[PDB]
Amino acid sequence: AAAPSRYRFVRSVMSIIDVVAILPYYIGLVMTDNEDVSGAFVTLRVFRVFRIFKFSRHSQGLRILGYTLKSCASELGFLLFSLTMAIIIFATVMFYAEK
Amino acid sequence: AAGVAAWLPFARAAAIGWMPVASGPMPAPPRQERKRTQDALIVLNVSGTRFQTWQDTLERYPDTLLGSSERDFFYHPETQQYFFDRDPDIFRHILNFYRTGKLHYPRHECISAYDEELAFFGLIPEIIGDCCYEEYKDRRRENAERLQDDADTDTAARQRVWRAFENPHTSTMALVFYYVTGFFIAVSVIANVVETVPCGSSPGHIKELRYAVAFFCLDTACVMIFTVEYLLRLAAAPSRYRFVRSVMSIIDVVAILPYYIGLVMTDNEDVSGAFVTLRVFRVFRIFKFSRHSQGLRILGYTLKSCASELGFLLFSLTMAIIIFATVMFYAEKGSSASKFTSIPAAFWYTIVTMTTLGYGDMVPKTIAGKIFGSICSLSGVLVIALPVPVIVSNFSRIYHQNQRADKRRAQKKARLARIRAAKSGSANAYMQSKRSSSFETQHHHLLHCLEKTTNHEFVD
Amino acid sequence: GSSASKFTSIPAAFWYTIVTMTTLGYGDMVPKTIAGKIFGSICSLSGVLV
Amino acid sequence: AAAAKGIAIALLVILVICSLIVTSVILLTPA
Amino acid sequence: PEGLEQLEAQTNFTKRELQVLYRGFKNECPSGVVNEDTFKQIYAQFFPHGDASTYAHYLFNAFDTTQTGSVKFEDFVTALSILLRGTVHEKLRWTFNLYDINKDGYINKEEMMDIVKAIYDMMGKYTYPVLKEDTPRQHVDVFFQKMDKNKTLDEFLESCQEDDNIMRSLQLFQNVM
């Protein structure tokens, strides 16, 4: 209602967290009105927890942490690459030396 | 305003804008001494350097020293140029202030001298144009806290007695007073430790038939020592109740309450499963070691200085624990052992692996368990090591502060001794003058006048 | 006060608290009561700090 | 140092005599 | 206080000396208004003997009329003028205000004990005749000898000339400087 931007506000991430929090209840209601798929209700339960991220507005430091991660994106990417490096190499060595 | 007095003609032209729409008498100019700007550069000197500038710039800002009329005292008519006895490089910035309207602050010049010069010319400290303010206020706060630590004003019937008792080092007295307490708290805590070993005090070798219950006697003696020490402290407090709330005092009072409460419980109605809590508090006597080593006090100051981000540590840890546990339990709720019976039973797993501890009591079984377990371990490394440096660096900084305070206290005492020595030298010089380069003569003369007006003489 | 209760004495709990202060972890003896896991985790965190 | 060592021994003695008082108290109640 | 407005008019100093006085004044109190706290150590360091803050405290409030809590240059130079190069009659009026501590100009024998003991506090411990607790009250009685036996500003102002000690003591600094 009090949206300075009707679409750019959604383009932000906090609204994404809000909608991710909202949707599982409604999609589960629609499913249980139409389907009883096995393995999807447990996924609903799993996604029934992200209000912890909804706590972001209350916690001043959470935005700080998020901006910290966003700023050092390249460093985290290199972290992931080097981890995959080491995992591949050493797991191969282990399997070929202990099978 | 007066800061742009160079631009009156501009507004004069602007006046011509609203002439046809005017209706009045047009009260005419208030006349002038001169309708020009021939006011020549006035050579104002600072300790031998001439800083020429225009008069109009100086009376641009009236309230400062160089503005208004209080510069007449510094005027030097016999050579027709202002003279100041101040520092040239400092004064250059004050000169720049009139030209622009906002001061600056050199990166590299003593804040005490700069501030005293700034106040000397009667201009407010906060004129800084927010370009050097971030540094001037930084250095000013640093100097203010330096002189606050310069003002420790530590002192030396019972008002001095209790302080001397609190004094860490009075050679013969305070050392004994501290060593007895240190030994006695040490033996109390080691007794609480050894009152559990089988042969010490428990049915370890009595099933066949030593289990010497004397630790009760030792505990009674020790706690009597604590309570008499705390009664001495209570009589030693300048404010009896007001200083009870102190951290060390509350540690002391909770280091003695459990024994009395246990005695009161013994002759009261017995409640099952309650003495264990009382025996737990027997270990808190070890907290009394705060007075022993200053490191504990530094740690307390650290934890209550960076007490802001510790709340963030706890909150983010709870976030991570909940988020990873709620996916662990649903990840392998159904399995062979199915150890992850419930979320509170998965808190233990998500905290034994977030800390990178690693036991093996419960480990993931399904493939979906492995990925999120490794993700949890990495996230635990991140979240745990994130607020570490803000604590250890803060602790090191506080320790350096507490070392610097002692160093400057020693230096201040040496300076005070030198002041006393110089005063004694002045008295010696006066006595030498009495027995047998004009200011000393006039000072001796004034003291001689004191001699006559109070009919007393001065002897070494 | 546990069934197995390998925490037979404070000189034995020394080993557990020193292997959880160091973030080492062996699993030879771990707490089994809700009153145990809380202080075990707190001990691990305090070990990281110290 | 040595002057501090002397009073250190002096206080060691008073700690010992306090402990011996405690031993007397425990021996007061044997079994 | 313009440096040319407060010339020999109302401040009997030559402007050449007045400039030097102001230069030396602001050099120690840059803000231009001296507080009593500064008024103590700028004075006590003249005497390497016992402290003088007691006398300086009684000097300050006499300097500072209307209890402003701090003295500006105008009042300071006015008082310094009336002392150093002022009138012999006007020299002693302020000093009568100084000795008076009960505000109203009356003498009840108690305003002199503290002043004389503060004056005697300068020498400290290295005096030739060692001070005793009776010595300050004895000197106070010596001063009481010359005050009005009958039950004052008028008698003091009329007898200061009678005691030539005051007359040629006030002239030590009247001619000089």
mmCIF file of N, CA and C in Angstrom, chain B residues 257-344:
data_model
loop_
_atom_site.group_PDB
_atom_site.id
_atom_site.type_symbol
_atom_site.label_atom_id
_atom_site.label_comp_id
_atom_site.label_asym_id
_atom_site.label_seq_id
_atom_site.Cartn_x
_atom_site.Cartn_y
_atom_site.Cartn_z
ATOM 1 N N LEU B 257 27.646 -17.304 50.563
ATOM 2 C CA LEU B 257 26.255 -17.668 50.812
ATOM 3 C C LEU B 257 25.976 -19.165 50.739
ATOM 4 N N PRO B 258 26.503 -19.931 49.773
ATOM 5 C CA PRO B 258 26.112 -21.347 49.681
ATOM 6 C C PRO B 258 26.352 -22.140 50.951
ATOM 7 N N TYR B 259 27.433 -21.871 51.679
ATOM 8 C CA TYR B 259 27.700 -22.613 52.908
ATOM 9 C C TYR B 259 26.635 -22.345 53.965
ATOM 10 N N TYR B 260 26.305 -21.071 54.183
ATOM 11 C CA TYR B 260 25.280 -20.728 55.163
ATOM 12 C C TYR B 260 23.927 -21.294 54.754
ATOM 13 N N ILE B 261 23.596 -21.197 53.465
ATOM 14 C CA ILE B 261 22.312 -21.706 52.992
ATOM 15 C C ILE B 261 22.256 -23.219 53.142
ATOM 16 N N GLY B 262 23.381 -23.898 52.913
ATOM 17 C CA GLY B 262 23.427 -25.328 53.146
ATOM 18 C C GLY B 262 23.212 -25.682 54.603
ATOM 19 N N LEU B 263 23.842 -24.931 55.510
ATOM 20 C CA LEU B 263 23.613 -25.179 56.930
ATOM 21 C C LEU B 263 22.149 -24.979 57.292
ATOM 22 N N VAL B 264 21.532 -23.914 56.773
ATOM 23 C CA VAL B 264 20.123 -23.656 57.059
ATOM 24 C C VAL B 264 19.246 -24.761 56.482
ATOM 25 N N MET B 265 19.628 -25.314 55.330
ATOM 26 C CA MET B 265 18.861 -26.407 54.743
ATOM 27 C C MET B 265 19.003 -27.691 55.550
ATOM 28 N N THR B 266 20.175 -27.922 56.149
ATOM 29 C CA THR B 266 20.399 -29.165 56.885
ATOM 30 C C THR B 266 19.395 -29.333 58.020
ATOM 31 N N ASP B 267 19.158 -28.276 58.793
ATOM 32 C CA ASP B 267 18.186 -28.342 59.878
ATOM 33 C C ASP B 267 16.788 -27.913 59.448
ATOM 34 N N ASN B 268 16.584 -27.617 58.166
ATOM 35 C CA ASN B 268 15.256 -27.373 57.632
ATOM 36 C C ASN B 268 14.698 -28.666 57.040
ATOM 37 N N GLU B 269 13.504 -28.581 56.455
ATOM 38 C CA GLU B 269 12.917 -29.749 55.814
ATOM 39 C C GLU B 269 13.766 -30.175 54.623
ATOM 40 N N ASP B 270 14.015 -31.477 54.521
ATOM 41 C CA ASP B 270 14.885 -31.995 53.476
ATOM 42 C C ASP B 270 14.105 -32.169 52.179
ATOM 43 N N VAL B 271 14.635 -31.602 51.099
ATOM 44 C CA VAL B 271 14.036 -31.688 49.772
ATOM 45 C C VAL B 271 14.957 -32.518 48.890
ATOM 46 N N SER B 272 14.408 -33.568 48.287
ATOM 47 C CA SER B 272 15.208 -34.454 47.452
ATOM 48 C C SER B 272 15.655 -33.740 46.183
ATOM 49 N N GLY B 273 16.868 -34.054 45.738
ATOM 50 C CA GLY B 273 17.393 -33.469 44.513
ATOM 51 C C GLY B 273 17.607 -31.973 44.582
ATOM 52 N N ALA B 274 18.136 -31.481 45.697
ATOM 53 C CA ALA B 274 18.428 -30.065 45.855
ATOM 54 C C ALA B 274 19.829 -29.780 46.368
ATOM 55 N N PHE B 275 20.455 -30.722 47.077
ATOM 56 C CA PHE B 275 21.800 -30.489 47.587
ATOM 57 C C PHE B 275 22.837 -30.448 46.475
ATOM 58 N N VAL B 276 22.555 -31.075 45.330
ATOM 59 C CA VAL B 276 23.505 -31.063 44.222
ATOM 60 C C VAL B 276 23.725 -29.640 43.728
ATOM 61 N N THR B 277 22.650 -28.856 43.635
ATOM 62 C CA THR B 277 22.785 -27.464 43.230
ATOM 63 C C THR B 277 23.653 -26.694 44.214
ATOM 64 N N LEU B 278 23.468 -26.945 45.511
ATOM 65 C CA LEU B 278 24.290 -26.281 46.516
ATOM 66 C C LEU B 278 25.755 -26.663 46.369
ATOM 67 N N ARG B 279 26.033 -27.950 46.152
ATOM 68 C CA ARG B 279 27.418 -28.383 46.012
ATOM 69 C C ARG B 279 28.052 -27.832 44.745
ATOM 70 N N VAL B 280 27.245 -27.566 43.715
ATOM 71 C CA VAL B 280 27.789 -26.988 42.489
ATOM 72 C C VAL B 280 28.431 -25.639 42.778
ATOM 73 N N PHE B 281 27.779 -24.817 43.599
ATOM 74 C CA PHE B 281 28.289 -23.483 43.885
ATOM 75 C C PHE B 281 29.573 -23.500 44.701
ATOM 76 N N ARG B 282 29.976 -24.658 45.231
ATOM 77 C CA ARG B 282 31.252 -24.746 45.927
ATOM 78 C C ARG B 282 32.425 -24.410 45.019
ATOM 79 N N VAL B 283 32.253 -24.528 43.702
ATOM 80 C CA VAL B 283 33.358 -24.260 42.790
ATOM 81 C C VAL B 283 33.559 -22.769 42.567
ATOM 82 N N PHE B 284 32.558 -21.942 42.862
ATOM 83 C CA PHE B 284 32.664 -20.517 42.576
ATOM 84 C C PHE B 284 33.709 -19.813 43.428
ATOM 85 N N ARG B 285 34.235 -20.470 44.464
ATOM 86 C CA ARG B 285 35.327 -19.879 45.228
ATOM 87 C C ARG B 285 36.513 -19.552 44.335
ATOM 88 N N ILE B 286 36.687 -20.303 43.245
ATOM 89 C CA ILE B 286 37.786 -20.054 42.325
ATOM 90 C C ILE B 286 37.668 -18.681 41.683
ATOM 91 N N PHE B 287 36.452 -18.134 41.598
ATOM 92 C CA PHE B 287 36.276 -16.802 41.032
ATOM 93 C C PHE B 287 36.959 -15.727 41.861
ATOM 94 N N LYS B 288 37.211 -15.990 43.144
ATOM 95 C CA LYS B 288 37.854 -14.999 43.995
ATOM 96 C C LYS B 288 39.264 -14.672 43.522
ATOM 97 N N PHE B 289 39.850 -15.509 42.668
ATOM 98 C CA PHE B 289 41.181 -15.243 42.139
ATOM 99 C C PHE B 289 41.248 -13.987 41.282
ATOM 100 N N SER B 290 40.143 -13.254 41.130
ATOM 101 C CA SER B 290 40.171 -12.024 40.347
ATOM 102 C C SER B 290 41.163 -11.026 40.927
ATOM 103 N N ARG B 291 41.199 -10.904 42.254
ATOM 104 C CA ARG B 291 42.167 -10.027 42.899
ATOM 105 C C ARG B 291 43.592 -10.551 42.786
ATOM 106 N N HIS B 292 43.769 -11.850 42.539
ATOM 107 C CA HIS B 292 45.113 -12.409 42.439
ATOM 108 C C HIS B 292 45.824 -11.908 41.186
ATOM 109 N N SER B 293 45.282 -12.223 40.013
ATOM 110 C CA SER B 293 45.878 -11.834 38.744
ATOM 111 C C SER B 293 44.971 -10.833 38.043
ATOM 112 N N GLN B 294 45.565 -9.745 37.550
ATOM 113 C CA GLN B 294 44.805 -8.699 36.880
ATOM 114 C C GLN B 294 44.210 -9.153 35.556
ATOM 115 N N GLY B 295 44.681 -10.270 35.002
ATOM 116 C CA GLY B 295 44.153 -10.732 33.731
ATOM 117 C C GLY B 295 42.663 -11.000 33.782
ATOM 118 N N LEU B 296 42.174 -11.505 34.915
ATOM 119 C CA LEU B 296 40.740 -11.715 35.061
ATOM 120 C C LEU B 296 39.982 -10.398 34.993
ATOM 121 N N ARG B 297 40.518 -9.349 35.623
ATOM 122 C CA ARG B 297 39.866 -8.046 35.558
ATOM 123 C C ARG B 297 39.894 -7.488 34.141
ATOM 124 N N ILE B 298 41.006 -7.685 33.428
ATOM 125 C CA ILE B 298 41.072 -7.250 32.035
ATOM 126 C C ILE B 298 40.038 -7.992 31.200
ATOM 127 N N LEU B 299 39.880 -9.293 31.449
ATOM 128 C CA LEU B 299 38.889 -10.075 30.719
ATOM 129 C C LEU B 299 37.475 -9.607 31.031
ATOM 130 N N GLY B 300 37.200 -9.295 32.295
ATOM 131 C CA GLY B 300 35.893 -8.762 32.638
ATOM 132 C C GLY B 300 35.619 -7.440 31.951
ATOM 133 N N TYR B 301 36.620 -6.556 31.924
ATOM 134 C CA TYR B 301 36.472 -5.287 31.221
ATOM 135 C C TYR B 301 36.262 -5.504 29.728
ATOM 136 N N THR B 302 36.930 -6.504 29.153
ATOM 137 C CA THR B 302 36.728 -6.811 27.742
ATOM 138 C C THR B 302 35.303 -7.278 27.486
ATOM 139 N N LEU B 303 34.843 -8.265 28.255
ATOM 140 C CA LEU B 303 33.518 -8.826 28.019
ATOM 141 C C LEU B 303 32.409 -7.829 28.321
ATOM 142 N N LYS B 304 32.649 -6.859 29.199
ATOM 143 C CA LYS B 304 31.660 -5.816 29.428
ATOM 144 C C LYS B 304 31.954 -4.539 28.658
ATOM 145 N N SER B 305 32.970 -4.547 27.798
ATOM 146 C CA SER B 305 33.218 -3.442 26.881
ATOM 147 C C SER B 305 32.666 -3.768 25.499
ATOM 148 N N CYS B 306 33.084 -4.895 24.934
ATOM 149 C CA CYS B 306 32.475 -5.405 23.709
ATOM 150 C C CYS B 306 31.320 -6.344 24.033
ATOM 151 N N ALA B 307 30.403 -5.859 24.866
ATOM 152 C CA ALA B 307 29.196 -6.597 25.208
ATOM 153 C C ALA B 307 28.082 -6.395 24.195
ATOM 154 N N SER B 308 28.299 -5.556 23.183
ATOM 155 C CA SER B 308 27.298 -5.354 22.144
ATOM 156 C C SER B 308 27.263 -6.533 21.182
ATOM 157 N N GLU B 309 28.405 -6.842 20.566
ATOM 158 C CA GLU B 309 28.441 -7.880 19.546
ATOM 159 C C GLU B 309 28.381 -9.285 20.127
ATOM 160 N N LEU B 310 28.544 -9.445 21.441
ATOM 161 C CA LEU B 310 28.345 -10.766 22.028
ATOM 162 C C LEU B 310 26.884 -11.183 21.929
ATOM 163 N N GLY B 311 25.970 -10.228 22.098
ATOM 164 C CA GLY B 311 24.571 -10.519 21.846
ATOM 165 C C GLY B 311 24.336 -10.956 20.416
ATOM 166 N N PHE B 312 25.024 -10.317 19.469
ATOM 167 C CA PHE B 312 24.915 -10.735 18.078
ATOM 168 C C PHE B 312 25.471 -12.138 17.882
ATOM 169 N N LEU B 313 26.582 -12.455 18.545
ATOM 170 C CA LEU B 313 27.108 -13.814 18.491
ATOM 171 C C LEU B 313 26.055 -14.811 18.934
ATOM 172 N N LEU B 314 25.448 -14.567 20.094
ATOM 173 C CA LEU B 314 24.458 -15.506 20.609
ATOM 174 C C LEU B 314 23.267 -15.616 19.665
ATOM 175 N N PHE B 315 22.800 -14.484 19.142
ATOM 176 C CA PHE B 315 21.610 -14.499 18.301
ATOM 177 C C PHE B 315 21.872 -15.203 16.976
ATOM 178 N N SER B 316 22.998 -14.899 16.332
ATOM 179 C CA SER B 316 23.327 -15.561 15.077
ATOM 180 C C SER B 316 23.624 -17.038 15.288
ATOM 181 N N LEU B 317 24.220 -17.398 16.425
ATOM 182 C CA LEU B 317 24.409 -18.810 16.729
ATOM 183 C C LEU B 317 23.073 -19.518 16.865
ATOM 184 N N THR B 318 22.105 -18.888 17.534
ATOM 185 C CA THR B 318 20.782 -19.495 17.631
ATOM 186 C C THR B 318 20.140 -19.630 16.259
ATOM 187 N N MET B 319 20.273 -18.601 15.420
ATOM 188 C CA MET B 319 19.758 -18.692 14.057
ATOM 189 C C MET B 319 20.350 -19.887 13.328
ATOM 190 N N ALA B 320 21.678 -19.993 13.327
ATOM 191 C CA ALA B 320 22.330 -21.074 12.599
ATOM 192 C C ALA B 320 21.943 -22.428 13.171
ATOM 193 N N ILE B 321 21.892 -22.537 14.498
ATOM 194 C CA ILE B 321 21.544 -23.800 15.132
ATOM 195 C C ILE B 321 20.149 -24.232 14.717
ATOM 196 N N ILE B 322 19.180 -23.320 14.807
ATOM 197 C CA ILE B 322 17.809 -23.667 14.457
ATOM 198 C C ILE B 322 17.717 -24.045 12.986
ATOM 199 N N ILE B 323 18.331 -23.239 12.117
ATOM 200 C CA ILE B 323 18.195 -23.453 10.679
ATOM 201 C C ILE B 323 18.792 -24.793 10.281
ATOM 202 N N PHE B 324 19.972 -25.115 10.805
ATOM 203 C CA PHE B 324 20.602 -26.366 10.410
ATOM 204 C C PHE B 324 19.976 -27.570 11.096
ATOM 205 N N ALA B 325 19.480 -27.417 12.323
ATOM 206 C CA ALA B 325 18.830 -28.541 12.980
ATOM 207 C C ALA B 325 17.514 -28.891 12.302
ATOM 208 N N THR B 326 16.739 -27.879 11.902
ATOM 209 C CA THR B 326 15.443 -28.155 11.301
ATOM 210 C C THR B 326 15.578 -28.819 9.942
ATOM 211 N N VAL B 327 16.735 -28.696 9.295
ATOM 212 C CA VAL B 327 16.969 -29.439 8.067
ATOM 213 C C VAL B 327 17.651 -30.774 8.333
ATOM 214 N N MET B 328 18.445 -30.883 9.399
ATOM 215 C CA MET B 328 19.032 -32.170 9.747
ATOM 216 C C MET B 328 17.960 -33.177 10.126
ATOM 217 N N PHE B 329 17.034 -32.779 10.998
ATOM 218 C CA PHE B 329 16.042 -33.731 11.483
ATOM 219 C C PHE B 329 15.154 -34.223 10.352
ATOM 220 N N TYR B 330 14.639 -33.306 9.533
ATOM 221 C CA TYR B 330 13.839 -33.720 8.389
ATOM 222 C C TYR B 330 14.674 -34.412 7.325
ATOM 223 N N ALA B 331 15.990 -34.203 7.328
ATOM 224 C CA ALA B 331 16.833 -34.830 6.321
ATOM 225 C C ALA B 331 16.944 -36.329 6.547
ATOM 226 N N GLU B 332 17.087 -36.754 7.800
ATOM 227 C CA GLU B 332 17.216 -38.174 8.092
ATOM 228 C C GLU B 332 16.404 -38.555 9.325
ATOM 229 N N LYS B 333 15.163 -38.067 9.404
ATOM 230 C CA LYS B 333 14.265 -38.525 10.459
ATOM 231 C C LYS B 333 14.018 -40.023 10.350
ATOM 232 N N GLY B 334 13.829 -40.518 9.132
ATOM 233 C CA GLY B 334 13.633 -41.935 8.913
ATOM 234 C C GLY B 334 14.891 -42.621 8.426
ATOM 235 N N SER B 335 15.496 -43.434 9.284
ATOM 236 C CA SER B 335 16.698 -44.173 8.931
ATOM 237 C C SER B 335 16.775 -45.407 9.818
ATOM 238 N N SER B 336 17.880 -46.143 9.694
ATOM 239 C CA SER B 336 18.056 -47.360 10.478
ATOM 240 C C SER B 336 18.090 -47.050 11.969
ATOM 241 N N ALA B 337 19.118 -46.328 12.412
ATOM 242 C CA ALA B 337 19.173 -45.918 13.809
ATOM 243 C C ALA B 337 18.238 -44.749 14.076
ATOM 244 N N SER B 338 18.127 -43.829 13.118
ATOM 245 C CA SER B 338 17.283 -42.645 13.245
ATOM 246 C C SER B 338 17.596 -41.892 14.534
ATOM 247 N N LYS B 339 18.890 -41.657 14.762
ATOM 248 C CA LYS B 339 19.316 -41.011 15.999
ATOM 249 C C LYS B 339 18.689 -39.638 16.161
ATOM 250 N N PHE B 340 18.420 -38.946 15.055
ATOM 251 C CA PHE B 340 17.863 -37.599 15.116
ATOM 252 C C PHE B 340 16.371 -37.735 15.396
ATOM 253 N N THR B 341 16.057 -38.091 16.641
ATOM 254 C CA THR B 341 14.670 -38.361 17.000
ATOM 255 C C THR B 341 13.816 -37.105 16.911
ATOM 256 N N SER B 342 14.375 -35.957 17.275
ATOM 257 C CA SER B 342 13.603 -34.724 17.280
ATOM 258 C C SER B 342 14.550 -33.540 17.197
ATOM 259 N N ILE B 343 13.966 -32.367 16.960
ATOM 260 C CA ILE B 343 14.770 -31.155 16.821
ATOM 261 C C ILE B 343 15.596 -30.864 18.067
ATOM 262 N N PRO B 344 15.047 -30.896 19.284
ATOM 263 C CA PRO B 344 15.917 -30.726 20.456
ATOM 264 C C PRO B 344 16.955 -31.821 20.587
#
